[PDB]
Design a protein around this ligand. Structure first.
Ligand SMILES: *[C@@H]1O[C@H](CO)[C@@H](O[C@@H]2O[C@H](CO)[C@@H](O[C@@H]3O[C@H](CO[C@@H]4O[C@H](CO)[C@@H](O)[C@H](O)[C@@H]4O)[C@@H](O)[C@H](O[C@@H]4O[C@H](CO)[C@@H](O)[C@H](O)[C@@H]4O)[C@@H]3O)[C@H](O)[C@H]2NC(C)=O)[C@H](O)[C@H]1NC(C)=O
Ligand SMILES: *[C@@H]1O[C@H](CO)[C@@H](O[C@@H]2O[C@H](CO)[C@@H](O[C@@H]3O[C@H](CO[C@@H]4O[C@H](CO)[C@@H](O)[C@H](O)[C@@H]4O)[C@@H](O)[C@H](O)[C@@H]3O)[C@H](O)[C@H]2NC(C)=O)[C@H](O)[C@H]1NC(C)=O
Ligand SMILES: *[C@@H]1O[C@H](CO)[C@@H](O[C@@H]2O[C@H](CO)[C@@H](O[C@@H]3O[C@H](CO)[C@@H](O)[C@H](O)[C@@H]3O)[C@H](O)[C@H]2NC(C)=O)[C@H](O)[C@H]1NC(C)=O
Ligand SMILES: *[C@@H]1O[C@H](CO)[C@@H](O[C@@H]2O[C@H](CO)[C@@H](O[C@@H]3O[C@H](CO)[C@@H](O)[C@H](O)[C@@H]3O)[C@H](O)[C@H]2NC(C)=O)[C@H](O)[C@H]1NC(C)=O
Ligand SMILES: *[C@@H]1O[C@H](CO)[C@@H](O[C@@H]2O[C@H](CO)[C@@H](O)[C@H](O)[C@H]2NC(C)=O)[C@H](O)[C@H]1NC(C)=O
Ligand SMILES: CC(C)CCC[C@@H](C)[C@H]1CC[C@H]2[C@@H]3CC=C4C[C@@H](O)CC[C@]4(C)[C@H]3CC[C@]12C
Ligand SMILES: CC(C)CCC[C@@H](C)[C@H]1CC[C@H]2[C@@H]3CC=C4C[C@@H](O)CC[C@]4(C)[C@H]3CC[C@]12C
Ligand SMILES: *[C@@H]1O[C@H](CO)[C@@H](O)[C@H](O)[C@H]1NC(C)=O
Ligand SMILES: *[C@@H]1O[C@H](CO)[C@@H](O)[C@H](O)[C@H]1NC(C)=O
Ligand SMILES: *[C@@H]1O[C@H](CO)[C@@H](O)[C@H](O)[C@H]1NC(C)=O
Ligand SMILES: *[C@@H]1O[C@H](CO)[C@@H](O)[C@H](O)[C@H]1NC(C)=O
Ligand SMILES: *[C@@H]1O[C@H](CO)[C@@H](O)[C@H](O)[C@H]1NC(C)=O
Ligand SMILES: *[C@@H]1O[C@H](CO)[C@@H](O)[C@H](O)[C@H]1NC(C)=O
Ligand SMILES: [Ca+2]
Ligand SMILES: [Ca+2]
Ligand SMILES: [Ca+2]
Ligand SMILES: [Ca+2]
Ligand SMILES: [Ca+2]
Ligand SMILES: [Ca+2]
Ligand SMILES: [Ca+2]
Ligand SMILES: [Mg+2]
Lengths: 946, 718
């Protein structure tokens, strides 16, 4: 925000050396601050690229810097029958430079190591190394935790177990406050990634020149994994340190694996012993999630937070559905050991192929606002595609999406400005942290110095109403009575290390809206509608207040009376003097407007005394935790007293509430306007009720309030409502409090199905039939203590009609049957049968945790028993399976309210290739007998009659 | 009625026409007491004033050039014209939207050129043996679809740089596979060998002369080869008048951008071709891998269709990549690469069975909305692509363009192009927000109070405040104040406490945070909803406090989306037919279903439950609900009469259908992983022989008749 983009400092190195690839700050014993810059491609003595490190002293004009001296010659040693060789050509020394106390660690990831023994060898691979330098005592040491004397044949015979030949140690380095250097090796364990931890003191005290291979007693490394997810994961691309377990003794590490889980990315938080405390997964394929990691306390709660980057993230645009812009994820550490959830904030870039988020650098309290800030670099962002750096300021809820300041790249195209960033250090000793940005393409480092921040508080005071009848003042140089009133302007400047001499220009304008010639109120002194003053606030901790007199013109000179008189005060810095270079940055309340008016229709007393009454009601009372709760507040306001001046409605909402919409039933062309702002910590919504609102006015407002996630608000939430009026008497109405209770409720759905729904058996192992049961937690809340029972006919015996082969549970539920199912190993008119009548087999499943949106599946396989199929094959067979589940409690403070129940029944019907059941020929026989009897009687009729 | 033209206007032709899409201006002199010149055309016509001077611009969609769609492409392919119209011109008045329609067709036979890009890692060695005689087979199989075919070959292993190479011992440089006693070529990044040629024998000759290299890292850098093949059009020779196919065969993972840090490469990749006369990637060791965004951009620019013919072990990864890059198809390649021919043959139809549309050179000023028309008159709102097509099928797309104001350019042009096709529609838009009468100018006219003002289209606009109807009230003049002309429905503050009552009208003031307009200074900007640092959701412009949505959006905040592209499943039905799509998200009305498209339901009735109607016509050519034409309207499955009854279909299960004949018809449903659902139905189902009583009763009655005849003849003799 307060960074100066005009007066920078440029440090340059040898051309074509990639100066500025990595950089850091260094503090000597006297407190002097210098810069350490690594140039991986510096030419060595043998006219070959070997890298180097430069210790730039702090100079305002910058320029060339001296270079620290490191050994750049190949080492060949003979021990026993083995020959150890080190190759430093194109080692890229300085790719990652860190400083701790009085030690500078510069690493060459691409240094090559080899071992020769007769014919076999360990192969020449880029093990990498790190050189530690102590300039004060002029001491040198080396550290290479991935040097071994194992031949390639042994690794081949062991399936490449514990293969550290491709560590590339030094890709990312970090030194803890205790003094334990940690180095990342993405290529270790055959492109799986690893970490190497070692104290600096042990490294210094355990180094003997000429001994290429040695072991540090306190050295520790991460372990290998066989999970296919870690394959080609590059676990160690970025490494950071922080506190996450709540105990100050242990130090937690954050390790990035951009290519984890098939190019998905991950960030793992581990303890000191390399135990996975947490894992954060990526969002999109090939997004390189985890390229850069940073740890800082943005919210100021005292608990470290996490920042992750994904340069290759692709967003959605109308022109093209995929646009590589990159992204940054902010995760906030919650209270307690609760696991980190979804990203707290998402930041997206604008320029295409900008690689936004490739470098995240903490800056501390840059503006001394009590909250930490950060800087995010896009190497190839901006309209011209030359690079940008965006400064994000912190707040109570986290970070601000809008970037406070954007710094461009003075270097030309291809400079990769912003590739390496570093801050949170004061180099000019002005009380504010500075920033350093490298650019290896142009081979230059740019230093930005923070400027003091001055906060301005402006207040304007004036009488609520004016009565032209009363005249007390007299115009200068004459004897003309005229009414007058006092206007008071208070301006105060605050900050840290602000200049001793400070001047601010304050401009006061009266009745700004009206034309200059048509102004109604004019200053008594100069008889002018506007004035300007130069206040010297330098060193004046208390605000400076000034007072002036303003008089109202004669009634004949103007005819407008109802229009309010508006007064504006504007505070600004002095115009740029010789040399430009403004000393400080001013922000805050630099413009304040206050409105008065002429007395009218206030009665004989000439003083308006409004009386305001407010009533509030709430609809949507049931608040469900973890749901898009939308309450509706209906407020009716009336003014039984005199007209209220500048009457507004103030509605203080809880922490998680928000404002969406508001309507006014009264009038259809009123154009209600409401605004929402965070005064200190609460989201106050101000709705305009009316300037001198008329007598007995009654206004009804219906507003929608969206209550966000709430897990600690308690049993009920509180909304406050009041009326704000500028009138001297009864400035506000009665305070209204609405208490909305909160209850937690969740619904669980059980659904059952059978495959195939319809089966036909013709006339060993018979046809396959499976029953599936699913539990779905559609409810917004969370349910624990889930217990389910599935009841099936039979007991898995040869006599049983159906035989259960296997039951597969999915979703983590733990299931056990009774009696045991599948005794044999087995290497392979409707009739109702159910657990109620036939023998019952019950399988019980348990789930202690069932989060929102999770689904649990239980499948059971079986086959109709052919020996039992053959017997009585002429009877239709419908089988039924039953389920019964319920939960114990919920993980929420609010006890209410029991629930949920469940009853699922699954049916399956079987058919045959037509049944041989006795066809109802009985009816045919009865009909034939009846016809025969009728014929016999008919014949006998005329037989006996004749 | 007052409408919205009469109010919030009546200042000049420009603003008057710029208020609402339907307003008219009466330039010809008439009575000025009727509040004329800003109202509906009907009101002006009722008030006359139409002596060829009425100003009322209307949007037009005149077609400049249009040609009929060709039927077959065999010769003179320069004028196939498979997309019509080719170029149209649109003229839109400010804040007005106009619609047009286009048609897309595949012209039967169309020339095809295929470039074969195959990895040459050690594990691929055996595969190289199965391709030595692929050119002739490919030509024979493809001759049934394309009469003009060209084929090509390519290779790629990885970046020749440590740790990807075996730098030591030195013998490994010219023979990395020396430990296993084998001969191999040095590592290379991309080696083009055969250009696209119509001589089939060249493909066979070039193959079997290649070899296989070796590397250390499992992932293979194939994206570099893909990008080099795409960008280097001249080196390999893509043909602009033919359909492009790029087969990418691999059996391992693929590198992405920022993976070159291990080898020291940090320079971002660029799409410029880097293939010299030696036919090799010169910048392989000095250029980083390309990102997916650049790959997709350069693949769409050159109109190249991509086929990921990958082994089963990494099929999921390339399926996940495929849904990102448009116009890409995935396929399973056998371990010996013996399924490549059929894979490419079917992938050709698969890719040509899909039509999409992309917009290029679209300025931010205007927005487009799309409707699609699949086969038959059915229309799917908010969709720019239709699935389930075939060769020769014609589809229609309705495109509605809406603008915001009139940009100060007056000449814009964009293009709508189907993926993988040269032909495209070029749409030229010219904005006309200026009235013709303004050309008269007359900057100084005596009617404007003796030549101290400007006259325009029948109204005098004068000075810095002179606004009287006769250009006489001035700014400081009109000191006496009249009534019943500054506030509506007297009883409210004048000018809504925002403006000054001068000249008899409310002149709005305080031009801060935007502009304020209105006959009573009630409408204004900077008074609308703010979603995230943007007004009216940042999509549409809000007028008079209403967040007027732009195209592709509809809502109070104008955040809800109308286009339904994301909520379309792979079965050709919106949200898999188990739910609706709202604001780009599928809501599953049917219980027990979840997912992005409501497709992953585990507890739904099997497919055969609703397939009874589909199989009716195939086996009987009759059945209920035949009026709806259910034979082929929703089920694309193919029915085949096979009595094999022993297929080992993993993703298949037998089921039964019940007929009025009371005979169970058992049939198989196979849902192949390729999406080619197939039904196997047994013809003439065996109905058990039930009726056997008719013969018995006939014999019984015959015996009774014989007995009766015997009795009759006995009586006759007696
Ligand atoms: C592409 O896809 C979109 C999305 O569905 C289609 O938009 C739909 O277009 C239909 C046809 O234009 C709309 O149907 C109706 O059309 C009315 C305009 O036409 C009027 O017709 C009456 C008939 O008596 C005439 O008197 C008038 O003079 C007009 O000519 C629409 O205004 C109307 O929509 C309603 O309007 C009322 C009043 O304005 C609204 O209060 C109401 O909310 C609704 O908008 C009616 O529906 C259809 O509405 C519209 N879909 C919408 C607006 O969501 C395109 O037509 C498709 N493209 C093509 C080429 O067909
Ligand atoms: C078009 O607009 C312009 C301003 O943009 C008008 O200019 C000024 O208009 C006012 C109108 O009130 C003039 O004032 C009026 O003038 C009369 C006449 O006085 C004259 O004075 C000149 C000397 O200056 C003599 O030579 C003449 O014979 C005559 O006596 C006077 O009685 C009042 O003061 C009255 O208000 C003003 O004079 C004029 N500006 C100038 C420089 O002359 C302009 O008039 C207007 N066109 C019109 C109204 O036709
Ligand atoms: C909800 O789930 C709980 C599981 O935690 C069920 O607990 C069981 O509750 C019954 C009360 O009906 C306890 O008594 C049992 O009653 C049956 C007759 O219904 C009887 O046959 C048993 O011998 C037993 O006495 C039962 O002990 C208890 N289970 C355990 C392990 O303690 C509860 O029933 C479920 N409620 C509903 C409504 O489903
Ligand atoms: C390629 O695409 C597949 C399919 O979209 C993706 O795999 C899916 O990854 C998600 C990751 O969130 C899995 O969800 C998780 O599954 C685990 C069990 O593995 C479960 O414990 C979690 O609660 C969560 O539900 C999802 O199951 C998985 N599905 C499949 C079919 O794999 C992924 O994007 C890519 N997978 C590859 C390349 O293997
Ligand atoms: C969408 O385009 C169609 C086709 O141009 C328009 O339909 C025609 O509209 C004109 C003008 O109203 C009529 O004269 C024609 O008879 C219509 N033809 C058909 C086939 O409907 C339609 O009006 C356009 N819709 C919009 C909203 O612009
Ligand atoms: C004593 C003697 C004469 C009695 C003979 C009874 C005769 C009339 C009976 C015996 C069997 C009968 C038939 C049996 C079955 C059918 C099929 C039916 O779809 C139409 C009627 C029809 C064709 C019947 C017609 C009447 C029938 C021919
Ligand atoms: C081949 C079979 C069916 C032949 C059986 C012969 C029958 C028709 C004979 C056996 C006995 C006979 C009956 C014997 C006696 C009498 C009494 C006489 O006053 C009238 C005839 C009458 C009633 C006869 C009718 C015919 C009769 C019923
Ligand atoms: C050397 O430095 C100059 C400084 O301007 C630069 O222009 C040039 O590119 C560098 N390299 C060579 C080879 O000169
Ligand atoms: C570690 O824990 C011990 C015992 O609780 C405590 O005395 C010590 O201060 C802790 N270390 C810290 C806080 O650094
Ligand atoms: C009022 O102050 C703002 C900054 O708060 C400034 O930009 C503006 O120029 C000032 N107005 C005038 C008239 O100087
Ligand atoms: C906001 O709340 C804090 C609580 O610590 C309080 O100190 C501060 O004064 C409040 N702000 C205002 C404007 O009252
Ligand atoms: C627009 O804003 C919300 C919040 O981001 C978004 O989720 C949704 O699509 C829109 N709002 C509503 C109410 O639909
Ligand atoms: C059908 O049943 C047979 C058993 O005879 C089985 O082999 C087959 O997999 C089942 N499914 C299909 C589609 O045939
Ligand atoms: Ca700890
Ligand atoms: Ca925190
Ligand atoms: Ca801050
Ligand atoms: Ca500083
Ligand atoms: Ca009073
Ligand atoms: Ca193979
Ligand atoms: Ca490789
Ligand atoms: Mg390989």
């Amino acid at each position: 925000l307060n960074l100066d983009p005009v007066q920078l400092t440029f440090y340059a190195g040898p051309n074509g050396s990639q100066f500025g690839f990595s950089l850091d700050f260094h503090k000597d014993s006297h407190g002097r601050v210098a810069i350490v810059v690594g140039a991986p491609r510096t030419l060595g003595p043998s006219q070959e690229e070997t890298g180097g490190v430069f210790l730039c002293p702090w100079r305002a004009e910058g320029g060339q810097c001296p270079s620290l001296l490191f050994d750049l010659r190949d080492e060949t040693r003979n021990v026993g029958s083995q020959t150890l060789q080190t190759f430093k050509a194109r080692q890229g020394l300085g790719a990652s430079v860190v400083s701790w106390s009085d030690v500078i660690v510069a690493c060459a990831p691409w240094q090559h190591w080899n071992v020769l023994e007769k014919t076999e060898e360990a192969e020449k691979t880029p093990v990498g190394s790190c050189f530690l330098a102590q300039p004060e005592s002029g001491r040198r040491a080396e550290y290479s935790p991935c040097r071994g004397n194992t031949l390639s044949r042994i690794y081949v015979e062991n399936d490449f177990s514990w293969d550290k030949r491709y560590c590339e140690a030094g890709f990312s380095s970090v030194v803890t406050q205790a003094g334990e250097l940690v180095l990342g090796a993405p290529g270790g364990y055959y492109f799986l990634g690893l970490l190497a931890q070692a104290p600096v003191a042990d490294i210094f005290s355990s180094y003997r020149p000429g001994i290429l291979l040695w072991h540090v007693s306190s050295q520790s490394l991460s372990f290998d994994s066989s999970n296919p997810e870690y394959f080609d994961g590059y676990w160690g691309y970025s490494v950071a340190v922080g506190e996450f377990d709540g105990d100050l003794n242990t130090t937690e590490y954050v390790v990035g694996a951009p290519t984890w889980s098939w190019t998905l990315g991950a960030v793992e938080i581990l303890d000191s012993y390399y135990q996975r405390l947490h894992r954060l997964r990526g969002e999109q394929m090939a997004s390189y999630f985890g390229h850069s990691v940073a740890v800082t306390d943005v919210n100021g709660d005292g608990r470290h937070d996490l920042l992750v980057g994904a340069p290759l993230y692709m967003e959605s645009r109308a022109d093209r559905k995929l646009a590589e812009v990159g992204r940054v994820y902010l995760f906030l550490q919650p209270r307690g050991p609760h696991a980190l959830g979804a990203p707290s904030l998402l930041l997206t870039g604008t320029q295409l192929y900008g690689r936004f988020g490739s470098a995240i650098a903490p800056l501390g309290d840059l503006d001394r606002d009590g909250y930490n800030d950060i800087a995010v670099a896009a190497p190839y962002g901006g309209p011209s595609g030359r690079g940008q750096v965006l400064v994000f300021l912190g707040q109570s809820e986290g970070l601000r999406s809008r970037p406070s300041q954007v710094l461009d790249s003075p270097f030309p195209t291809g400079s990769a400005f912003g590739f390496s960033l570093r801050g949170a250090v004061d180099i000019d000793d002005n009380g504010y942290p500075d920033l350093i940005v490298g650019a290896y393409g142009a081979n230059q480092v740019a230093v930005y110095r923070a400027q003091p921040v001055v906060k301005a508080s402006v207040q304007l005071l004036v009488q609520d109403s004016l009565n032209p009848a009363v005249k007390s003042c007299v115009l200068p140089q004459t004897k003309t009575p005229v009414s007058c009133f006092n206007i008071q302007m208070c301006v105060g400047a605050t900050g840290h290390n602000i200049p001793q001499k400070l001047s601010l220009n304050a401009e006061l304008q009266l009745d700004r809206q009206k034309p200059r010639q048509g102004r109604r109120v004019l200053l008594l002194g100069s008889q002018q509608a506007g004035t300007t003053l130069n206040l010297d606030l330098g060193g004046k901790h208390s605000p400076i207040c000034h007072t002036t007199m303003a008089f109202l013109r004669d009634e004949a000179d103007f005819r407008d009376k109802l229009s309010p008189i508006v007064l504006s005060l504007n505070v600004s810095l002095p115009p740029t003097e010789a040399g430009m270079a403004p000393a400080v940055v001013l922000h805050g309340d630099t413009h304040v407007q206050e409105q008065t008016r002429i007395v009218l229709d206030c009665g004989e007393d000439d003083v308006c005394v409004p009386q305001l009454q407010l009533t509030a009601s709430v609809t949507g009372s049931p608040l469900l935790v973890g749901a898009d709760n939308v309450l509706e507040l209906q407020m009716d306001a009336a003014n039984e007293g005199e007209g209220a001046y500048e009457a507004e409605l103030a509605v203080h909402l809880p922490q998680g509430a928000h404002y969406m919409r508001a309507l006014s039933n009264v009038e259809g062309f009123e154009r209600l306007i409401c605004n929402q702002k965070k005064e200190n910590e609460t989201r106050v919504v101000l709705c305009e009720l009316g300037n001198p609102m008329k007598k007995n006015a009654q206004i009804g407002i219906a507003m929608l309030v969206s209550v966000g996630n709430l897990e600690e608000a308690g049993e009920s939430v509180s909304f406050q409502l009041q009326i704000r009026s500028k009138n001297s008497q009864n400035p506000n109405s009665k305070i209204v409090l609405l208490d909305v209770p909160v209850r937690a409720e969740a619904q669980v759905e059980l659904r059952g199905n059978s495959f195939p729904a319809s089966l036909v058996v013709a006339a060993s192992w018979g046809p396959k039939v499976e029953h599936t049961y699913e539990l779905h937690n559609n409810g917004p809340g969370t349910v624990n203590g889930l217990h389910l029972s599935i009841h099936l006919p039979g007991q898995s015996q040869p006599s049983d009609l159906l035989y259960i082969l296997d039951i597969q549970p999915q979703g983590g539920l733990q299931c056990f049957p009774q009696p045991p199912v599948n005794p044999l190993k087995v290497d392979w008119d409707p009739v109702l049968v159910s657990c109620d009548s036939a023998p019952c087999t019950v399988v019980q499943c348990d789930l202690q945790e069932m989060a929102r949106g999770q689904r649990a599946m239980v499948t059971v396989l079986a086959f109709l028993w052919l020996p039992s199929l053959y017997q009585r094959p002429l009877d239709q067979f419908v089988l039924q399976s039953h389920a019964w589940f319920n939960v114990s409690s919920l993980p929420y403070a609010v006890p209410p309210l029991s629930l949920p129940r469940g009853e699922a029944q699954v049916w399956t019907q079987l058919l045959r290739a037509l049944e041989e059941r006795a066809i109802p020929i009985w009816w045919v026989l009865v009909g034939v007998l009846g016809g025969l009897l009728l014929l016999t009687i008919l014949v006998l009729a005329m037989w006996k009659v004749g | 009625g007052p409408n919205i033209c009469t109010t919030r206007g009546v200042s000049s032709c420009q603003q008057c026409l710029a208020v609402s899409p339907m307003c008219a201006w009466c330039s010809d002199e008439a009575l000025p007491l009727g509040s004329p010149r800003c109202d509906l055309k009907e009101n002006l016509l009722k008030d006359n004033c139409a002596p060829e001077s009425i100003e009322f611009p209307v949007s037009e969609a005149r077609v400049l050039e249009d040609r009929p769609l060709s039927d077959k492409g065999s010769g003179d392919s320069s004028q196939v014209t498979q997309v019509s119209p080719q170029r149209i011109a649109l003229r839109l008045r400010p804040d007005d939207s106009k619609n047009f329609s286009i048609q897309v067709r595949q012209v039967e036979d169309y020339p095809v050129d295929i470039y074969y890009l195959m990895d040459l890692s050690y594990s691929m060695k055996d595969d190289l043996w199965s391709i030595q005689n692929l050119g002739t087979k490919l030509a024979t199989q493809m001759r049934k679809l394309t009469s003009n075919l060209r084929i090509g070959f390519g290779a790629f292993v990885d970046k020749p740089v440590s740790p990807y190479m075996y730098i030591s011992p030195p013998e490994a440089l010219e023979n990395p596979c020396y430990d296993m006693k084998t001969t191999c070529l040095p590592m290379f990044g991309y080696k083009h060998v055969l250009t696209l040629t119509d001589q089939v024998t060249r493909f066979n000759e070039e193959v079997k002369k290649q070899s296989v290299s070796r590397n250390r890292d499992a992932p293979e850098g194939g994206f570099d080869a893909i990008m080099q093949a795409t960008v280097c059009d001249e080196k390999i020779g893509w043909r602009n008048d033919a359909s492009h196919l790029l087969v990418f065969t691999t059996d391992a993972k693929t590198h992405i951008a920022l993976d070159g840090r291990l080898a020291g490469i940090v320079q971002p990749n660029d799409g410029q071709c880097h293939v010299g006369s030696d036919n090799h990637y010169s910048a392989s060791t000095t250029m980083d891998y390309p990102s997916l965004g650049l790959m997709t951009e350069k693949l769409s620019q050159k109109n190249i269709n991509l086929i990921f013919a990958v082994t089963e072990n990494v099929v999921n990864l390339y399926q996940n990549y495929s849904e990102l890059i448009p116009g890409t198809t995935v396929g399973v390649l056998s371990m010996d690469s013996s399924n490549v021919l059929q894979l490419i043959v079917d992938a050709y139809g698969k890719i040509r069975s899909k039509v999409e549309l992309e917009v290029r050179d679209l300025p931010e000023e205007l927005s487009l909305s799309f409707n699609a028309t699949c086969l038959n008159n059915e229309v799917i709102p908010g969709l720019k692509s239709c699935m389930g097509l075939k060769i020769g099928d014609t589809v229609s797309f309705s495109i509605e363009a809406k603008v915001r104001g009139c940009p100060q350019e007056k000449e814009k042009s964009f293009t709508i192009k189907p993926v993988g096709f040269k032909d495209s529609l070029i749409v030229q838009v010219t904005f006309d927000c200026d009235c013709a009468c303004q050309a008269q100018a007359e900057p100084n006219s005596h009617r404007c109070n003796n030549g101290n003002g400007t006259f325009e289209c029948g109204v005098c606009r004068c000075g810095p405040g002179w606004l009287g109807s006769q250009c006489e009230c001035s700014e400081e003049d009109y000191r006496p104040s009249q009534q019943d002309e500054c506030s509506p429905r007297e009883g409210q503050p004048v000018c809504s406490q925002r403006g000054e009552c001068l000249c008899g009208q409310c002149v709005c003031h305080s031009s801060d945070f935007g502009k304020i307009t209105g006959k009573y200074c009630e409408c204004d900007d900077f008074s609308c909803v703010r979603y995230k640092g943007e007004m009216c959701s940042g999509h549409g412009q809000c007028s008079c406090g209403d967040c007027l949505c732009d195209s592709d959006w509809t809502g109070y905040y104008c955040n809800c989306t109308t286009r339904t592209d994301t909520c379309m499943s792979s079965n050709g039905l919106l949200c898999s037919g188990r739910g609706k799509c709202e604001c780009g998200s599928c809501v599953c009305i049917q219980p027990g279903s979840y997912g992005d498209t409501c497709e992953k339901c585990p507890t739904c009735p099997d497919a055969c439950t609703f397939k009874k109607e589909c199989v009716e016509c195939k086996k009987f050519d009759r059945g209920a609900l035949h009026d709806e034409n259910t034979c082929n309207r929703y089920c694309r499955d193919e029915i085949e009469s096979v009595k094999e009854l022993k297929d080992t279909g993993k993703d298949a299960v037998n089921c039964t259908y019940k007929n009025e004949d009371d005979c169970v018809v058992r049939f198989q449903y196979y849902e192949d992983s390729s999406g080619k659902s197939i039904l196997y139905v047994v013809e003439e189902p065996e109905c058990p022989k039930g009726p056997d009583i008719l013969v018995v009763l006939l014999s019984v009655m015959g015996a009774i008749l014989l007995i009766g005849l015997a009795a009759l003849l006995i009586w006759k003799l007696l």
